[PDB]
Design a protein around this nucleic acid. Sequence first.
RNA 1: GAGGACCGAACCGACUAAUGUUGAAAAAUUAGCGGAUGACUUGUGGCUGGGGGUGAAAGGCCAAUCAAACCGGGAGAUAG
RNA 2: CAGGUGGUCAGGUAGAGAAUACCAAGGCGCUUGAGAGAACUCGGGUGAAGGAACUAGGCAAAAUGGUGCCGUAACUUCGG
RNA 3: UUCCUUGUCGGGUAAGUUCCGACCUGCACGAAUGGCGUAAUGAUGGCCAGGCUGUCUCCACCCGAGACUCAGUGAAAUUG
RNA 4: GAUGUCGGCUCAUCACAUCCUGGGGCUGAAGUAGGUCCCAAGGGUAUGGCUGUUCGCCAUUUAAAGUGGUACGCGAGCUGGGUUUAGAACGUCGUGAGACAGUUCGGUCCCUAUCUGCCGUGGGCGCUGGAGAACUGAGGGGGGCUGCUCCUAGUACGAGAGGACCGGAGUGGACGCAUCACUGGUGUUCGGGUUGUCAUGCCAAUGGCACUGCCCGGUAGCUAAAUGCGGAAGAGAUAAGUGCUGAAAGCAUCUAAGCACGAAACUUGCCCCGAGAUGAGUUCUCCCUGACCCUUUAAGGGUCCUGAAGGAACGUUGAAGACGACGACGUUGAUAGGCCGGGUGUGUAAGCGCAGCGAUGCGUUGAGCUAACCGGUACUAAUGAACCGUGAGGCUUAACCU
Lengths: 123, 125, 209, 114, 56
Amino acid sequence: MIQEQTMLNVADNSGARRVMCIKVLGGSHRRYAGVGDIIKITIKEAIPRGKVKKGDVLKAVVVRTKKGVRRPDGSVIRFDGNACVLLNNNSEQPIGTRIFGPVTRELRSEKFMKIISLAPEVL
Amino acid sequence: MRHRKSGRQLNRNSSHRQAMFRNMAGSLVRHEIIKTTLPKAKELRRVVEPLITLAKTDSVANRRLAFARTRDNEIVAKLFNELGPRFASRAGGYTRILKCGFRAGDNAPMAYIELVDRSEKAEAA
Amino acid sequence: MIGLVGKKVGMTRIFTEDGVSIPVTVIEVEANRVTQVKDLANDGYRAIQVTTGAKKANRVTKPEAGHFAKAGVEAGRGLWEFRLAEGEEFTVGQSISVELFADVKKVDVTGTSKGKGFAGTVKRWNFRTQDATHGNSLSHRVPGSIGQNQTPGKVFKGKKMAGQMGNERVTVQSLDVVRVDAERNLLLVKGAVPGATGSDLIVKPAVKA
Amino acid sequence: SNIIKQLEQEQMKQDVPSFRPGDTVEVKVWVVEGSKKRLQAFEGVVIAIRNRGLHSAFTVRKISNGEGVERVFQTHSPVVDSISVKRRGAVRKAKLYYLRERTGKAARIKERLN
Amino acid sequence: AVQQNKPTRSKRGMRRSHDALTAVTSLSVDKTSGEKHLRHHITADGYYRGRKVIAK
RNA sequence: GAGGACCGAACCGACUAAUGUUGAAAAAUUAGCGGAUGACUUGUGGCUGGGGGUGAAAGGCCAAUCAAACCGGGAGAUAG
RNA sequence: CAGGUGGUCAGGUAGAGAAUACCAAGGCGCUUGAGAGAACUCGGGUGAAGGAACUAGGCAAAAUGGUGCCGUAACUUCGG
RNA sequence: UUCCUUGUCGGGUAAGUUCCGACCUGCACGAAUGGCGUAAUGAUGGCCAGGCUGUCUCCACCCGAGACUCAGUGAAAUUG
RNA sequence: GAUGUCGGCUCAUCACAUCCUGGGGCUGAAGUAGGUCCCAAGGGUAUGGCUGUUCGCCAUUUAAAGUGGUACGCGAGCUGGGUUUAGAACGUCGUGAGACAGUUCGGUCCCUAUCUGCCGUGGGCGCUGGAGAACUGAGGGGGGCUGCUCCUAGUACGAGAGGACCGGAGUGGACGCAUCACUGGUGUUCGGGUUGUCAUGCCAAUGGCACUGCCCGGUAGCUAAAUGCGGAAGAGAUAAGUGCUGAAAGCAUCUAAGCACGAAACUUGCCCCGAGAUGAGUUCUCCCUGACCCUUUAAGGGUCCUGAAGGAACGUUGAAGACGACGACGUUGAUAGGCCGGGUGUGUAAGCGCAGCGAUGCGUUGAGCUAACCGGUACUAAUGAACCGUGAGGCUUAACCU
Ligand SMILES: [Mg+2]
Ligand SMILES: [Mg+2]
Ligand SMILES: [Mg+2]
Ligand SMILES: [Mg+2]
Ligand SMILES: [Mg+2]
Ligand SMILES: [Mg+2]
Ligand SMILES: [Mg+2]
Ligand SMILES: [Mg+2]
Ligand SMILES: [Mg+2]
Ligand SMILES: [Mg+2]
Ligand SMILES: [Mg+2]
Ligand SMILES: [Mg+2]
Ligand SMILES: [Mg+2]
Ligand SMILES: [Mg+2]
Ligand SMILES: [Mg+2]
Ligand SMILES: [Mg+2]
Ligand SMILES: [Mg+2]
Ligand SMILES: [Mg+2]
Ligand SMILES: [Mg+2]
Ligand SMILES: [Mg+2]
Ligand SMILES: [Mg+2]
Ligand SMILES: [Mg+2]
Ligand SMILES: [Mg+2]
Ligand SMILES: [Mg+2]
Ligand SMILES: [Mg+2]
Ligand SMILES: [Mg+2]
Ligand SMILES: [Mg+2]
Ligand SMILES: [Mg+2]
Ligand SMILES: [Mg+2]
Ligand SMILES: [Mg+2]
Ligand SMILES: [Mg+2]
Ligand SMILES: [Mg+2]
Ligand SMILES: [Mg+2]
Ligand SMILES: [Mg+2]
Ligand SMILES: [Mg+2]
Ligand SMILES: [Mg+2]
Ligand SMILES: [Mg+2]
Ligand SMILES: [Mg+2]
Ligand SMILES: [Mg+2]
Ligand SMILES: [Mg+2]
Ligand SMILES: [Mg+2]
Ligand SMILES: [Mg+2]
Ligand SMILES: [Mg+2]
Ligand SMILES: [Mg+2]
Ligand SMILES: [Mg+2]
């Protein structure tokens, strides 16, 4: 349940540490973005020598939320923080090469198979 | 909305309601019949009758628990020594609400509420 | 096709063996007994009138009792009509069971929604609340403007205002039939249906696809 | 009512083990990835239990790869294959929600030692 | 907000057409004392359904 | 043990908001706010009088009254 | 008539305290009540995820809050 | 204090008619109707950040006082 | 002898000179994508940064971010930033008092709704004997949005790059309705922890007050962020448009006679209201089958007898509700309370024993308590009555029976 102005942690090694969602993509008046949704972000804090720098405007896919995901049997999977993975602004491919922390199977799609294959744990 | 909710507010806050019904329950078991408004009388049933059910099993735990609900040892004594044995065989319904006229000062619907076994032999004590 | 009159028992869930929880509404559908058949000749339209449930003989009036005695059925808790489609034939006194929905896939459930009483415009029409602070004076949940200046000089009919909400007839369409339990007079539909627990429901096959 | 409880008791599992809040359990769930279906384990602390018959549930919390994860299971769902208690904890409360604010040595739970 | 014209005595009487009181339909008669009383209420002397329930 | 020193009650004040606006009140209440040993505050009594007083100065205040108080008189001013 | 009105008296427990909380001595329940438990208004409590995106403006609210010890920058009129 | 004007450049922001730094083209700064600096101070003006939050996305529930019903009393502005 | 004046907020409504979606003609239209014009108003039609701003610029979206009217819609609905009093200052003008759509800081937004209107909800009477139900549907309202992916097909088209129509499937956004099984929120009526203090003689145990004292959990109910469903298909008549046959006019010609297509618009189809539809409809069932007098002799008045069906009232009440209303029930009774059992929540009561110098710990013990929940149970309260409502229901004509 991510909206604009929401700060997210970064679950990859692209160099960013804190990003802020500036737009929930995919529909007019769209309010929230859950796990698996693409968002437009700006980088609020980065490491000194990463692949990205503070101020860039990219896209990201949400991989962990405190609100959590709902499974078809009614189960919930909540996380302690919101996290995303930075994507190329036009190619929608992950920028980093590693993934930290677990992800969910909502990402199990040919578009994010690169993320599923790199994740340390899929829930 | 009020769906399935129980308990009347009686235009009081929670602490006032609790104190009032505590006093009114003590007065009921002391005199075995009192006169009050019909709404107050109907809510008093859900307070005093659980005390009588509690008083059927004499024990220091029940006595203390009854004391916590009434805060009057004279009331607790009568509950466990008189009203307990008197209702040992009755399964609930220890009170009786008899509607009467309207209060002169504010036209409030009044009602008597009494213990059911307040017979002609109650004059002994 | 005709429908049936049941009672909302409540909501539960059905676990599918492949690990899916289906929220279902349990509808008790006892035998619906046909009490009157209307035809084009005598009434100008084809329909059946059914009753269901039971009723204490001391609560039925002589006009109602004579209506049930005319049909030869026991008095139920009410009467409902169903327009007959071309080809459906029913006789008075005939009983209709829940197994009529054996092959029906989707149904429309009609009931009386729960009553909210007098509801404000925020609850009834999803109006936006005005500012809670920033100087707002006694105007937090009020509807705001209700018209234009002198040119119309009136409030248009159908304006959304506060008033009675709920406690009205509501139909939910195209609900999947999860299970038809004939021997227990049960009908499990996926989803939620209008009304409180114990209210009467009218279940008809889906008029749409 | 008698009707609904009759429909629910015929779906409930009959061998769900007894566990309390504070015990560490290992839940094995069914993960379907197409034509396969394997068992994925999920071990952690039971921080809440909802007793509602068929609608009963319990939420397990674990620290996975530095990230805290809570998962609410529907105990009578066929997705949950089995439940095994690893160690029994000794807590005073029924809902261990305060464990969300603690970590490392602060999130330790005494063993019940029964 | 206030009236722009004085309402008439006719309009005033129409509004009060619903203000009429409803007298009690009929009083019950006690089986023992034969007194009249409001139904489901005790009598003036403390009788109800043929029983002296209060001795006052 | 100095201070137009600091924090903060009484006390004096009146910065913000809400309420109230045919008010509980012709200026308040509630929650916060400033000063709080001083150019402080307060009681009692006194003095300054209307083109006059007084004013750390706002044309402020001078009995709910002020770019000239109130009361009586000129006076039935005058009113294209 | 929720305003204003100088001085004197100053118990207990906790507390730095005449703050504050609960009590003593003592005095009161504020001169309409009774029900109900809609919208809406007022005064409050709590709130998933987000956290100023509100708005003229963080208005309001939330938050901070004590004692001891450690530690404390630019700048400085050497006191801060 | 600058009309043209949201001047231009730089900083801050994903985006800054405000803010900070500079430029000088000062419509119409300027030296006791003082010029330029200035630590401390401010219920002073502008701007930023952390924290914090029902300010908001988007409202939900709850506790009280009214509103509503019954009994008693009983106004007001306004009105061809 | 006052029509409150910008912008914002809330809430709108209409126009079409259409921003998107729909239908077309032409193209300097290969395809994709456009350009332009015609038809079309059903629905839809951003969030932010800056500024009082409308606007605009910018950032990032979207199928699209339409243009206008409505006292530049909307202050007896909100706001008060701007403008637009009194204070003060700058620049400027003036000898000066002062002045400046120049600038700057500060600066009281009242009204209990009579009428119309509107949203709800009742009372009366009517509908021609009365009553209880079930309907018909004249008419009215609601609803009508759209993305992306996949298949068709890397096909048609194209040098290549690229890349379809038509048709089908899935899955979203926004919006609406319903619901509470799930996930949660709330839960001052449930349980527990704890600070200060006062009290119950004291210990122990409890209670009061301190915002519910502060907190931690939490039942029912309500509820969204939760999860179900919805927008259609089809039909009729058409718009622009495309035609067939075909003369006037030996040809030609979509038109004059005739015939066929043709869109989210129209009329239906879907949902809701609906016989005060006074044009007051239909169907089924139920109830009433006494006398007598007067008079101006009639749709007359009166007395006695009679009081039905049913209704209302009263009571117990409800997931119904401001009040009315509506629903259930009233001993031939589960309507409410209580009670019994269960469930749920809280988390191992009190007392006692043991260990310890003690705080405390352990055992009895998943104990005790447990609201609104579930299943039972006449223990209490829903009374015999009384009340209202009558006694076969006008005239004319027609078809039928006598
Ligand atoms: Mg009251
Ligand atoms: Mg209701
Ligand atoms: Mg809003
Ligand atoms: Mg005001
Ligand atoms: Mg007109
Ligand atoms: Mg000082
Ligand atoms: Mg001070
Ligand atoms: Mg104050
Ligand atoms: Mg000071
Ligand atoms: Mg002046
Ligand atoms: Mg004065
Ligand atoms: Mg003269
Ligand atoms: Mg004169
Ligand atoms: Mg004083
Ligand atoms: Mg004090
Ligand atoms: Mg209330
Ligand atoms: Mg929150
Ligand atoms: Mg939170
Ligand atoms: Mg934050
Ligand atoms: Mg902003
Ligand atoms: Mg804004
Ligand atoms: Mg503030
Ligand atoms: Mg505060
Ligand atoms: Mg900002
Ligand atoms: Mg700003
Ligand atoms: Mg500058
Ligand atoms: Mg100067
Ligand atoms: Mg100077
Ligand atoms: Mg400053
Ligand atoms: Mg009155
Ligand atoms: Mg006038
Ligand atoms: Mg408009
Ligand atoms: Mg047009
Ligand atoms: Mg249409
Ligand atoms: Mg206007
Ligand atoms: Mg107006
Ligand atoms: Mg202003
Ligand atoms: Mg001035
Ligand atoms: Mg106003
Ligand atoms: Mg009028
Ligand atoms: Mg709940
Ligand atoms: Mg003690
Ligand atoms: Mg006390
Ligand atoms: Mg209290
Ligand atoms: Mg129990």
